[PDB]
Amino acid sequence: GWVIGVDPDIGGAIAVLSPDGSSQVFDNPFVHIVVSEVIRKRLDTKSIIQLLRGLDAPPGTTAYIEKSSPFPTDGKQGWWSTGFSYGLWIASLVASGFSVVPIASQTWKAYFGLMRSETPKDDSRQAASILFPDKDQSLKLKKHHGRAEALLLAAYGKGLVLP
Amino acid sequence: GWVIGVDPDIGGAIAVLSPDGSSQVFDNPFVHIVVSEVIRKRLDTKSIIQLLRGLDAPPGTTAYIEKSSPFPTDGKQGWWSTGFSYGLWIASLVASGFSVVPIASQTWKAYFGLMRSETPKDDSRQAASILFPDKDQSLKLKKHHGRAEALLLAAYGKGLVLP
DNA sequence: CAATCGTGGGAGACCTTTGGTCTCCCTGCAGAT
DNA sequence: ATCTGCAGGGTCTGGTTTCCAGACC
DNA sequence: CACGATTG
Ligand SMILES: [Mn+2]
Ligand SMILES: [Mn+2]
């Protein structure tokens, strides 16, 4: 039936698949905040919760969420934000009645044969245009890869296959 | 009327202050989970949300939460965990109808004179015992420092003063 | 189970299959149009 | 406003402040 | 602070 996919990161997105085959994808809401005399994007908690309350996906719907897995060579700040974004989404999803299943990125990539691409982001947008042709207008910019990760995650939990 | 204090860490706690002067403090609910073939404690999102749902504190109540601010000499795992707890708690608090106010540890410590102690944790329990005498038995143990921090954050937003 | 200490650290999934291998982001910031 | 590239990074309060001291998990 | 470890 209904499936939710969540790319939890700052350029990420939430994708919702209804049982009639239609689909929605939203950019993750963010705000600009001061940290240590610079400005930085942080997910917008209030907006995210308002969004999750405006979905028609019923309680108990499974939200598939990409497990943040920072590399040992990423910075401590990178570790912090990805932990923070992840906790914010998990808690907002659990609080809004949705069932949360974390999925490793290697899981949904191998499912769609996206492993070992020279152009992984480009390829994700292309595979999501294929799976969701009405969204292809909304998938043409490189910055849109996060929308494509969400849609693909949702595609994975829903069982869809590339043609 | 009502004030909430949150020490969002694994050994932290949530403290709720009534207008009638009573107080409760709960340990943060955790679960043991597998990470990279070892066992690690993580906050329990479902138990947290349930706890927040059963509190008498009415909506709009302010929760004062300690800003996580890890040290640069702390490891990337510490940065990830603190960021995640923080995000889990903020999101759970906003979804439970409460208004979240982040408070740095320098701020409430300065407020209660706790700065630059040799035994910061002991002093916190002692200060929380003086402010919440009926919690005196809940602060006997050295591992009870999280209950203290949580209570002191709530006393801070409450405008309480030491004798 | 309650304290203490000391350094600061990947994690995941699937095969080669009980370990060995291999794969995966992101943040933050500085120039680039 | 989108892009790219590349290394991996503290953050906070407050001061008779315009950066910096001194503090914190 | 986390993360492992020891030590009661
Ligand atoms: Mn993403
Ligand atoms: Mn604490």
A154 Cα to the center of ligand 1, angstroms: 13
Task: Provide the domain limits for residue A76.
Answer: 3-158
B83 contact A CB<8A: yes
Within a 13 Å sphere around the CA of A28, how many CA atoms are in the beta-carbon half? 31
| Residue B163 maps to a domain | no
Give burial (CB, 10 Å; 0-12/13-18/19+) of A35.
exposed
**A90-105 as b/e, with b when 16 or more CB fall inside 10 Å?**
bbbbbbbebebebbeb
Q: Distance between CA A11 and CA A147 in Å, rounded?
A: 8
Is residue A57 in a domain? yes
Residue B116 tokens read as 């630059």
> How many independent structural domains does chain B possess?
1
Is there a domain that residue A39 lies in? yes
Q: Which of B12, B4, B20, B19 lies closest to B52 in space, CA to CA?
A: B4
Query: Does residue B99 lie within any of the structural domains?
Result: yes
**Which CATH number is B153's domain given?**
3.30.420.10
Question: What is B25-92 written as a DSSP string?
Answer: EEEPPEEEEEETTEEEEEE-HHHHHHHHHT-SSPTT-EEEEEPP---TTS-HHHHHHHHHHHHHHHHH
**Is B124 inside a domain boundary?**
yes
Q: What are the CA-CA distances from residue A161 to residues A39, A108, A148, A154, B102 (Å)? A: 41, 11, 15, 12, 45
With beta carbons less than 8 A apart as the criterion, state whether A80 and B79 touch: yes
For chain B, breaks with the C atom over 2.5 A from the next N come after none
Shortest Cα distance from B107 to chain A (angstroms)?
A: 16
Backbone dihedral region for residue B87 (phi beyond 0: left; psi -120 to 50: alpha; all else: beta): alpha
Asked whether residue A111 is domain-assigned, the answer is yes
B146 sits in which H/E element? helix B145-158
Contact call for residues A107 and A156 (beta carbons, < 8 A): yes
Query: Rounded to whole angstroms, how far apart are CA atoms B12 and B31?
Result: 14
Spatial neighbors of B23 by CB under 8 A, at least 6 apart, are: B15, B16, B17, B132, B134, B135, B151, B154
Task: Find the residue in A nearest to B96 (Cα).
Answer: A95
Q: How far apart are CA B74 and CA B96, in angstroms?
A: 32
What is the distance between the alpha carbons of residues A83 and B40, in angstroms, rounded to a whole number? 15
Q: How far is the CA of B9 from the C1' of C11 (A)?
A: 22
Q: Is A107 helix (H, G, I), strand (E, B) or coil?
A: helix
Q: Does the annotation place B37 within a ligand binding site?
A: no
Protein-covered nucleotides of chain C (CB closer than 7 Å) are 2-4, 7-14, 23-29
Cα of B6 vs centre of ligand 2, distance in Å, is 9
The answer to whether position A17 is within a domain reads yes
Q: Is residue A163 part of a domain?
A: no
User: What does this entry list as its resolution, in Å?
Assistant: 2.4
Give CA–CA dist A66/B64, Å, rounded.
30
State the best of B71, B92, B101 to mutate against chain A, taking most chain A CBs within 10 Å.
B92
